[PDB]
Amino acid sequence: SPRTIAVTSGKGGVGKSNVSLNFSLSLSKLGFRVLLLDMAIGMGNIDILLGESSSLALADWFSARLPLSELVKSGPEHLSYIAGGTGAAQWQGLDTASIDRFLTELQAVASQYDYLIFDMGAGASGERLYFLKSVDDVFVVTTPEPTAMTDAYAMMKYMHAAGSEAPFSVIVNRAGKEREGYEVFERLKHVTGRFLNKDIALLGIIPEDRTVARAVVSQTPFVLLDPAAKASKAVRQMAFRYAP
Amino acid sequence: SPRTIAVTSGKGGVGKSNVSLNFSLSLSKLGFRVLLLDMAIGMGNIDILLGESSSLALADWFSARLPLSELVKSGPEHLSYIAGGTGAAQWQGLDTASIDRFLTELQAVASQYDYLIFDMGAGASGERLYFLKSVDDVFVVTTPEPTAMTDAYAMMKYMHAAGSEAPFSVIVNRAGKEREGYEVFERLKHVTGRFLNKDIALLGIIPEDRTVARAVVSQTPFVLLDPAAKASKAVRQMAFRYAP
Ligand SMILES: Nc1ncnc2c1ncn2[C@@H]1O[C@H](COP(=O)(O)OP(=O)(O)O)[C@@H](O)[C@H]1O
Ligand SMILES: Nc1ncnc2c1ncn2[C@@H]1O[C@H](COP(=O)(O)OP(=O)(O)O)[C@@H](O)[C@H]1O
């Protein structure tokens, strides 16, 4: 059966979507079959980062009983994905019931992949914390800024309070120096272990790199736009270390 | 009798909290009575940016039969504010009835201010949209990035579809050149004006500035840390133009 990963964060602006897509693409390149799901319904960024014209999206599954398998889009390197959507006139969100049915139709087309990767909406919500208790791995993205780190810790506290028992792995992104990344992680590891009795791990450290910004403007993922960039190697390396 | 302003964004990481805080400080410095409310309950960032330690916050208000009046904290330059809080063993979310409670109790002190400024959670929610219709002005913050701009559009579309009659004013933050701010605004004004038949205004353009990031690490608001910085003058002049 496929391994499920949810990528999350304390707050937006930590590069969580960029990490999700570029980590998924690295997994694809190693030869795995990956389905990436943009769980930001009506506010999805996965399509934009690939520079793909908006077409059918998850929000459409909410709105026409269309089966999930027809939402599945092909991306570079054999990556499959499902977009969050541009939405209709009015706002639409997920509740626990609709989350439930979604998970059901998902396993119907899940068995094909080695990995199912969920790009979660940033931060916490009742419905998001509900979704997160089922996954095998929870990735938590943070940067070295105090706001991002404080919010990452809160997020881990809430997922834990809401009975998530999944292993938490930290991705320290936008690190200035490699030591700085380890020290961000030590701080988070200290507070989670002492206050929550929760032992977390470091998935990897991604440096601050202009290539990322360049990749976003040009709408071409950085691991593909420049595989030799520092961030690109850091993410390829993270994926390699994660995979068996 | 105060004027109410909700500062919103399509996605996090656009500088919204920094803009909310530094714009409020500029208004207070012009001599107005300002109350800033951090609506990111359980994930408050305003305390952090100010370098002030915890104290009571919305997270203590939520569960614990306590009047908003007692959450008011004194910030620099005579700014008053209410912190979102660090939580809370468990996640807690504003629902329709808690918003009513909030807005009701808010009327007990609203009278003592010229401006109430709500630093809203980023993105949309059924709850946020219910909150955003008792406000006079909606500021929408974006950067020149395509993800940020697309999300800002969708947020404006959602607020408009939910019956919001308030004028939308855009803040383009992290502009590389002042001209890029106009390029960003022109695109947004275009798609909103042609598709939604909604006339939006430019509140101002804030340049990319290392000073901002320095202010976050130093936990001292950038307009106070260095009043001469480019971003600091931009925000000060934005507030001057907005105030009577
Ligand atoms: N490693 C990095 N180096 C430089 N900029 C980065 C890096 N990671 C992320 N960013 C910047 O952060 C912005 C927001 O990234 P995004 O993936 O949208 O984050 P989130 O999903 O956390 O909001 C990007 O558009 C880019 O400017
Ligand atoms: N004008 C700017 N110049 C440089 N960096 C900025 C600017 N505005 C925001 N930032 C950066 O963006 C980060 C996130 O800002 P924040 O106010 O927390 O955004 P949001 O509330 O939209 O998530 C800041 O800590 C800082 O690194």
DSSP string, chain A: -PEEEEEEESSSSSSHHHHHHHHHHHHHHTT--EEEEE--TTS--HHHHHT----S-HHHHHHH---GGGT-EE-GGG-EEE------SS-----HHHHHHHHHHHHHTTTT-SEEEEEPPSS--HHHHHHHTS-SEEEEEE-SSHHHHHHHHHHHHHHHHTT--SPEEEEEEEESSHHHHHHHHHHHHHHHHHHH----EEEEEEE--HHHHHHHHTTS-HHHH-TTSHHHHHHHHHHHHH--
Give which of A178, A163, A169 is closest to A231, Cα–Cα: A178
Report the nearest-CA residue for atom 16 of ligand 2.
B15
- Shortest distance between the Cα of A187 and any Cα of chain B, in A, equals 15
- Residue A197 contacts by C-beta under 8 Å, 6 or more apart in sequence? none
Phi, psi (degrees; rounded to nearest 5) at B3: -85, 135
Alpha-carbon distance of A128 to A98, in angstroms, equals 12
d(CA B141, CA B55): 29
Give the C-alpha separation, B94 to B58, whole Å: 10
List of E strands, chain B = 3-9, 34-38, 73-74, 80-82, 115-119, 137-142, 168-175, 201-207
| The one-letter amino acid at A10 | G
Does domain A1-244 correspond to CATH entry 3.30.930.10? no
Using DSSP bridges, classify how beta strands A80-82 and A73-74 pair: parallel, antiparallel or unpaired. antiparallel
Cα(A15)–Cα(B13) distance, integer angstroms: 9
- Give the chain A residue whose CA is nearest to the CA of B126: A91
State the method: X-ray
Return the residue in A47, A48, A91 with the most chain B beta carbons within 10 A, the one to mutate for interface testing: A91
SS3 (DSSP) at B41:
coil
- In sequence order, the 6+-apart residues with CB closer than 8 A to the CB of B211 are B222, B225, B226, B229, B230, B231, B232
Instruction: Tell me the sheet residues that pair with B118.
Output: B6, B37
How far apart (Å, rounded) are the C-alpha atoms in residues A172 and B218? 20
* CA-based nearest residue to B3, from B169, B123, B233: B169
Distance CA A24, CA B133 (A): 40
Contact A147 B122 (CB under 8 A): no
Question: What DSSP character marks residue B148?
Answer: H
In chain A, where the domains are located: 1-244
Q: Which of B240, B231, B186 is nearest to B208 (CA)?
A: B231
| Strand arrangement of the beta sheet that strand B73-74 belongs to | B73-74, B80-82, B34-38, B115-119, B3-9, B137-142, B168-175, B201-207
Taking an 8 Å cut-off on Cβ atoms, the answer to whether B147 and A123 are in contact is no
For ligand 1, mutation pick of A21, A139, A212, A217 (most atoms within 8 Å of CB): A212
Neighbour tally for B97: CB within 10 Å: 8
Residues from chain B contacting residue A219 (CB–CB below 8 Å):
146
C-alpha distance from B86 to closest chain A C-alpha (Å): 7
Contact list in B for residue A161 (CB cut-off 8 A) is: 89-91
Interface test with A, best of B8, B11, B39, B219 (most A CBs within 10 A): B11
Resolution stated for this PDB structure, in Å: 1.9
